[PDB]
């Protein structure tokens, strides 16, 4: 059983800087039995290397590979804007099943940007249906690592909020986050103040946006 | 230039069989390994199995009991068949040519859910710069297309990926940041299109 392992999970570098991705194997694998793939959101994986440093046909000369035994490395000498994708390594030609690595997401490196927080209460149209969804939005922030917490009457909520984040905006290299807290009409009409508190690196202190069921 | 073209049924009820087919056009057959791969939502890739000119069936032990791969030489095609599928098998499936693996198919998204097709419900997240949006809740299956002012407004728009609610239906939101001066000047309407339900909803978002 040969398992493959990639680190880091997220590499954040600027266009022009050199990128070095790693792949670690359980057993000892010959350098010719390793391959690399580049995949973008929505598209199929694009083969980069099929050996140690065997640059596949149609692959730019900036990609290279090295390694032996267990430690292998994919390398991009000079990053270009079309290189920020998700890279995988694969063991091919050794012991089946020929599994893949966990993947390494490449990210653009911009300065720290604090999110803009907004909170939307359930519209009067939705309350007539029997359910209520409160929305919290964090617009244009970097890095992606940020946490959001819901509080109904200053009580920590859990197990009832879902989350979604967009891809890195190709214009300002920032992210956007939306959290939906869903409650029945009765549980919504039970209590009064609803607050969404975000903790992010660009904030000197956690920022709360709240509304009261009435005002 | 070798090309691969896949087809098959995408939406399957649980506890039934999935059948996909892949056709190779512009390349040689035999000497290449015809492999299948699946990628779950938000996860990596999994190797399913491979086959060649003859019956070289080498599957994956994690799903070997329910997988069968066949090949047809008179049409240069190869088919994948899965049995007793569940919601865990929801993934994007690709066919590829192991040589590494050079050419990949376009992929087909296969979702397994006991839920039925239902049109979305659009509600307005009203403002109070500024931000406003639309909440598209309780629709199945994906996708839905959201625009603003019938394509006129595109800047500052963020449409978020859906989430599979516990009820089995999807829900997303599309927000947009606009200068607060236009709240009384500009009319903001979101257009939601759902092809699987054959539905379109124009929702006006006015300041509450």
Alpha-carbon gap, residue A84 to A94, rounded angstroms: 30
Answer whether A39's CB lies under 8 Å from A85's CB: yes
- CB–CB contacts below 8 A, A to B: 110
**Number of separate helices (H) and strands (E) present in chain A:** 2, 17
Q: Which residues of B touch A98 (CB under 8 A)?
A: 47
The residue of chain A with its CA nearest to that of B176 is: A139
| Elucidation method | X-ray
Q: Is A159 helix (H, G, I), strand (E, B) or coil?
A: coil
Answer whether B147's CB lies under 8 Å from A84's CB: no
Alpha-carbon gap, residue A5 to B96, rounded angstroms: 22
The residue of chain A with its CA nearest to that of B164 is: A162
Q: State the Cα torsion A43-A48-A51-A53 to the nearest 10°.
A: -160
Q: What tokens were used for B58?
A: 């080498």
Judging by DSSP bridges, how do beta strands B67-72 and B77-82 pair with one another? antiparallel
Question: Which residues make beta-bridge pairs with A10?
Answer: A105
Task: Resolution in Å, one decimal, please.
Answer: 3.2
Query: Testing the interface with B: which of A30, A42, A98 to mutate, by most B Cβ within 10 A?
Result: A98
Answer whether A194's CB lies under 8 Å from A183's CB: no
Q: Transcribe A79-129 into DSSP letters.
A: --GGG-SEEEEEE-SSSSS--B---EEEEE----BPPEEEEEPPPHHHHTT
Q: Which domains does chain B have, with CATH numbers?
A: 3-112 (2.60.40.10), 121-205 (2.60.40.10)
CB contact set of A60 (below 8 Å; sequence gap of 6+): none
Q: Which residues of B touch A96 (CB under 8 A)?
A: 58, 60
Facing residue for B44 by CB, picked from A47, A49, A103: A103
Strand stretches in B26-128, DSSP E: 33-39, 46-49, 67-72, 77-82, 91-98, 101-104, 108-112, 121-125
Whose structure tokens read 């329910």? B66
The residue of chain B with its CA nearest to that of A166 is: B160
Q: Which of B28, B17, B151 is nearest to B84 (CA)?
A: B17
Full strand arrangement of the beta sheet holding A86-91: A10-13, A104-108, A86-91, A34-39, A46-49
Q: Which domains does chain A have, with CATH numbers?
A: 4-108 (2.60.40.10), 116-212 (2.60.40.10)
Say if residue A31 is preceded by a cis peptide, omega within 30 of 0.
no
The residue of chain A with its CA nearest to that of B43 is: A102
Answer whether A186's CB lies under 8 Å from A150's CB: no
Whose structure tokens read 């009435």? A214
Decide if B158 and A164 are in contact by the 8 Å CB cutoff.
Answer: no
């Amino acid at each position: 059983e040969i398992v493959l392992t990639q680190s880091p999970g997220t590499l954040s570098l600027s266009p022009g800087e050199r990128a070095t991705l790693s792949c670690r194997a359980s057993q000892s694998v010959s350098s010719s039995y390793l391959a690399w793939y580049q995949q973008k959101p929505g598209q199929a994986p694009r083969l980069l290397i099929y050996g140690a440093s065997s640059r596949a046909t149609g692959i730019p000369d900036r990609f290279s590979g090295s390694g032996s035994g267990t430690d292998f490395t994919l390398t991009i000498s000079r990053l270009e804007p079309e290189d920020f994708a998700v890279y995988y390594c694969q063991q091919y030609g050794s012991s089946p099943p020929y599994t893949f690595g966990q993947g390494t997401k490449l990210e653009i490196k911009r300065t720290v940007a604090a999110p803009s927080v907004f909170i939307f209460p359930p519209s009067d149209e939705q309350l007539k249906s029997g359910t209520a969804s409160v929305v919290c939005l964090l617009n244009n922030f970097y890095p992606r690592e940020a946490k959001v917490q819901w509080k109904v009457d200053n009580a920590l909520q859990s197990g009832n909020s879902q989350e979604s984040v967009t891809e890195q905006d190709s214009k300002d290299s920032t992210y956007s986050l939306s959290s939906t807290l869903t409650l029945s009409k009765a549980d919504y009409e039970k209590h009064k103040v609803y607050a969404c508190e975000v903790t992010h690196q660009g904030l000197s202190s956690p920022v709360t946006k709240s509304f009261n069921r009435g005002e | 230039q070798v090309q691969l073209q896949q087809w098959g049924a995408g939406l399957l009820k649980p506890s039934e069989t999935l059948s996909l087919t892949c056709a190779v056009y512009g390349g040689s057959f035999s000497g290449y390994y015809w492999s299948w791969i699946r990628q779950p939502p938000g996860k990596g890739l999994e190797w399913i199995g491979e086959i060649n000119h003859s019956g070289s069936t080498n599957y994956n032990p994690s799903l070997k009991s329910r997988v069968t791969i066949s090949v047809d030489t008179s049409k240069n095609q190869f088919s994948l068949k899965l049995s007793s599928v569940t919601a865990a098998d929801t993934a994007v499936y690709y066919c590829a040519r192991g040589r590494g693996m050079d050419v990949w198919g376009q992929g087909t998204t296969v979702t397994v859910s006991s839920a039925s097709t239902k049109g979305p419900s659009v509600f307005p997240l009203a403002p109070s710069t500024a931000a406003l949006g639309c909440l598209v809740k309780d629709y199945f299956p994906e996708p839905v297309t959201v625009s603003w002012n019938s394509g006129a407004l595109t800047s500052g728009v963020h449409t978020f990926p859906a989430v599979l609610q516990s009820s089995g239906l999807y829900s997303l939101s599309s927000v947009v940041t606009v200068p607060s001066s236009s709240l009384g000047t500009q009319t903001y309407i979101c257009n939601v299109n759902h092809k699987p339900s054959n539905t379109k909803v124009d929702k006006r978002v006015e300041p509450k």
